[PDB]
Amino acid sequence: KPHRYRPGTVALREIRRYQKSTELLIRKLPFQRLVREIAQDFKTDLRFQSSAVMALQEASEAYLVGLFEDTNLCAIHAKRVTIMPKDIQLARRIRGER
Amino acid sequence: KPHRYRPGTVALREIRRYQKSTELLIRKLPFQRLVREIAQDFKTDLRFQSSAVMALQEASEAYLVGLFEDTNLCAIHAKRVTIMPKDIQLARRIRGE
Amino acid sequence: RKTRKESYAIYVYKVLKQVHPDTGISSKAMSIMNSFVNDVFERIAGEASRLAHYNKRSTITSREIQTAVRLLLPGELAKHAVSEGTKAVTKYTSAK
Amino acid sequence: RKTRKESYAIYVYKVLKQVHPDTGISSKAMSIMNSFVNDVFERIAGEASRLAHYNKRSTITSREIQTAVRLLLPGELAKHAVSEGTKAVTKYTSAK
Amino acid sequence: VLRDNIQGITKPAIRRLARRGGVKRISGLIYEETRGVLKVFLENVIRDAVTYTEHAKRKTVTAMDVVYALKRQGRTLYGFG
Amino acid sequence: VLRDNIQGITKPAIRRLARRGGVKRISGLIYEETRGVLKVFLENVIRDAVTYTEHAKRKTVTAMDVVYALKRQGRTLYGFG
Amino acid sequence: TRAKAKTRSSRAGLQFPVGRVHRLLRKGNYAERVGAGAPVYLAAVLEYLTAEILELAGNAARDNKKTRIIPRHLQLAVRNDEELNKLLGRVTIAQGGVLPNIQSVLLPKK
Amino acid sequence: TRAKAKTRSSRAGLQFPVGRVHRLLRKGNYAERVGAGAPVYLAAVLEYLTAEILELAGNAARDNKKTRIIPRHLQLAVRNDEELNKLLGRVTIAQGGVLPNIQSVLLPKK
DNA sequence: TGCACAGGATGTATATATCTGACACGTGCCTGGAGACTAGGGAGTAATCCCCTTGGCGGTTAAAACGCGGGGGACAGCGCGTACGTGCGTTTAAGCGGTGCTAGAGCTGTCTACGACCAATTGAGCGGCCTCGGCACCGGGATTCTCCAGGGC
DNA sequence: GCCCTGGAGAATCCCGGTGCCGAGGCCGCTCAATTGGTCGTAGACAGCTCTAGCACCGCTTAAACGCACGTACGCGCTGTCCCCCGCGTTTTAACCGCCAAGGGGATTACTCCCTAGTCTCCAGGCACGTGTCAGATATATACATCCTGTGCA
């Protein structure tokens, strides 16, 4: 009796919404903490420009979005609609990163 | 009863042989004619160096072999053992061509 | 007073006012366009440098730039770019 | 006679006699090694040139070569190359 | 020192990235894989950026360093310098 | 004037390439698709090589021109110069 | 006495700076010498490319019902024009988003 | 009088030509000035890389019962070493072939 | 009666003998590298300013997390029919070797027009400033799409 | 029992009104581009040699081509179940604004050391010539591999 959308309607809705928007999708403070942690291993007491952290975020998001596009293509080639770690790995091996 | 090998034994044998060898696998005169025909559309009365055509052939074989490796990977991803035009197209799409 | 920085912003604005008179641009978009002009400059100039070295020449000329444009641009863009550059050089030679 | 062409063949042969005293090399393999040395030279020199331009300097120095080696080589290759280059520069400064 | 910061990239964030990528259904094992891939990419870029910063004799990593590292990796970014 | 020279690549040669690539079974449409792919690649490289030849004011394409074109496309070739 | 100064950009009919391009060519370690027509050719080519991108971006902004061009409009122009997509295929545009694209197998079965 | 000439390569302890590398750096349009230790460092690095590749290729030739290195042995060395493969990941070696790799699903079932 | 085995056939690795042509060395010469020196500017160093990075605190919500119910998609199993592999006989050019010819690459000598270099002058382009309208946000009403309950065929 | 359809209901679109902050224009000044002239060399140009790319022929034979058969494999279908999705509630920590302190980037003046530029001198590296041994090829042999007919536990 309570309203329920079927499994996939809301997912298509989110696809349209986030393909229409342009804003960053990860949280800024957690991403910054991750970047500082990764940089610890390369040099100690490093300082970061805010624009530097923002540029890193934009690059990482663009990379991940393109990777997920290729992953979806691989999954569809396997006659699936669910993306899987093997789809990610096949995309990275065809791109030439592993 | 004449001897026959099963369908795939000779194919694996050919795989091992041609992965052991280093020679060029396309015929040189047909490749040269193809190269001259393609260059014909960019300039007339063009002359070629033997080393130019040989370099072109080496690059073309290297490209096709790498593409076929990626195609086999895609076909295996699709739970097949036969490579297909869809596999070639997907490989080229993920490569960026 | 802050030190002087150079950008292609005023020229980008001039070209924008030529093609779309009632249209403007934001600061981020101007930054992107400045980056685009710099990138294209570096690509063309590096290719011309390599061509001059390949031919054992000491000078970068209009024909080096033309060949670099033909090598770097995709097709119709290349032929229209060649037309524009040839026209500009002819007009410059006619003037002075 | 023909005009002289420089190559790295005699130096590659010297290193081959250092590492494998009883092994020879064919002319095609020597061509490949010549191409490899020219490629690595061009890569490192270009990275150093870009570093100097980025930092607003007119001189390519050992600092630029070390940084370019770090950028262009993967891991242990970079570590050992940096060790070798520092050794050579120290020996040169000791000598003259 | 900082620890466990890869978990600040959360499942809903990976879902939003996948939706922008056009993904309808996501497997539960995707999130750890994406965390590993992101860590690899970030490590490469940050290594190159810190190398640039050290050559300049600076203690602060700048947007120009990030842009140079991305350009070295063939991932040119517009709009930061 | 040359015509009908892409058919000289022939099915057995494409099959030999696919064997060196490590494949076991081949479809019938693969041969035509591979002919098209090879033609595209050759057109790109030969166009660039003729551009280099025309810049040098030469009527002969050289191994150097081919190497420079392949290096322009990120496909460096060792062993010809 | 000395004549009135004209810019080489005005002599060539361009809105891009010929003299600045010449200085950048001379100080960029490209060759030992730079010809006189090379900066003219290069400035003309840069102007043409800029005009192409700006025209397409302004069209996209008009479609969005905006007067100001933004990075979203720049990205839409680039990714929708095929030759500019080939030229800039390896470039990332900050705050540019992606094109709307859903694969037809994911759409509800109708 | 002037002394007997020593080469900078012998001063550095190297088998690679320091002065030739210096001349190439000077005529290559990389910067306005070249320091004294830059060719020394560059020649040392080039020698080290050549030594690594030649060592692996000589080992590969020894496994073949040959005394001369050939392009096939060079390719085997490069493709079997992980860091060298990363360094030469988009280079084609003429007459080198491929590595012997067959996928496991294509092998016959026991 | 479905799963080892024997044995036959086929392909492949191994050892030995001939032969040739390409590698490795020696020689002569020339041109590019080394030695010695001068002059000038790039960069190292010190000192100083002020921007911007970091760190902390508190309140407000948006967003993440956690659990739950159920539908739909992944995956395994089965059957069919066709498309590809394997082998055989016929046909077609490929490769190889000769010869002959000439176009064009490569090099040399001459000389002139073009680009570096320099000094002096000025206006275009940049920084700082100030203002207004394009856009972001809000709220309310209209339209569209999704889903299910219910009834006709 | 299956397909169509009308209402709910949720989401999106559209419209109208407000506030604000960033684009756009203005103004002063200073640094870089322009002007006019000189000079020395790179490149345009003509001439000439000789290499190599093209063209033709004839023969041998490897490789392509066409065909027939059968068998694995691609593909479609069906059924199970479990895992991911949509939704509702609770909890966390992002986020925003504000404040304060100090590190470190950015600039400037100064001086010295390093590097370019020149000239002379010569030895190291390139081209050429020659000989001998590693590798390619034949050939016969021994061994590993595959496939099926056969028997039984």
XYZ file of N, CA, C and O (backbone and C1' of nucleotides) in Angstrom, chain G residues 2-3 6 8 11 20 23 68, chain J residues 23-24 32-36 42:
88
model
N 60.353 59.806 -36.552
C 59.826 58.452 -36.453
C 58.320 58.423 -36.685
O 57.581 59.278 -36.195
N 57.871 57.418 -37.429
C 56.471 57.290 -37.795
C 55.646 56.751 -36.631
O 56.168 56.262 -35.628
N 52.443 51.124 -35.456
C 51.387 50.172 -35.748
C 51.778 48.822 -35.169
O 52.956 48.463 -35.156
N 51.950 44.756 -35.310
C 51.975 43.729 -36.341
C 50.659 42.970 -36.389
O 50.250 42.499 -37.453
N 48.638 45.063 -38.599
C 49.080 44.865 -39.976
C 48.560 43.554 -40.551
O 48.315 43.459 -41.757
N 53.864 39.453 -28.875
C 53.988 38.563 -27.726
C 54.280 37.138 -28.169
O 55.097 36.448 -27.548
N 57.945 36.981 -29.044
C 58.790 36.920 -27.857
C 58.746 35.533 -27.228
O 59.784 34.981 -26.844
N 26.149 34.051 -19.945
C 27.551 33.893 -19.592
C 28.013 32.473 -19.892
O 27.342 31.508 -19.518
P 33.091 36.356 -12.577
O 32.831 37.295 -13.837
C 31.718 37.047 -14.662
C 31.139 38.332 -15.222
C 31.978 39.026 -16.280
O 31.127 39.697 -17.168
C 31.757 40.441 -14.433
P 31.483 39.774 -18.725
O 31.554 41.332 -19.001
C 30.522 42.154 -18.543
C 31.051 43.522 -18.210
C 32.156 44.026 -19.136
O 31.690 45.166 -19.818
C 32.638 44.465 -16.847
P 58.692 43.558 -19.428
O 58.184 43.241 -20.895
C 56.802 43.150 -21.146
C 56.453 43.783 -22.475
C 57.260 43.272 -23.664
O 56.443 43.236 -24.793
C 57.548 45.573 -23.477
P 56.658 42.111 -25.906
O 56.209 42.823 -27.257
C 54.963 43.466 -27.331
C 55.046 44.722 -28.177
C 55.670 44.547 -29.562
O 54.966 45.335 -30.495
C 56.812 46.217 -28.396
P 55.016 44.992 -32.060
O 55.356 46.385 -32.751
C 54.774 47.577 -32.274
C 55.655 48.771 -32.589
C 56.325 48.762 -33.970
O 56.033 49.984 -34.647
C 57.895 49.268 -32.266
P 56.377 50.201 -36.204
O 57.165 51.584 -36.210
C 58.025 51.891 -35.144
C 59.110 52.838 -35.586
C 59.616 52.616 -36.997
O 60.073 53.852 -37.535
C 61.320 52.055 -35.431
P 60.429 54.005 -39.094
O 62.018 54.077 -39.102
C 62.668 55.018 -38.280
C 64.146 54.714 -38.169
C 64.808 54.236 -39.459
O 66.020 54.941 -39.659
C 65.270 52.734 -37.705
P 75.335 30.033 -39.961
O 73.844 29.529 -40.205
C 72.760 30.235 -39.642
C 71.621 30.381 -40.637
C 71.194 29.105 -41.349
O 69.787 29.101 -41.499
C 71.941 30.703 -42.943
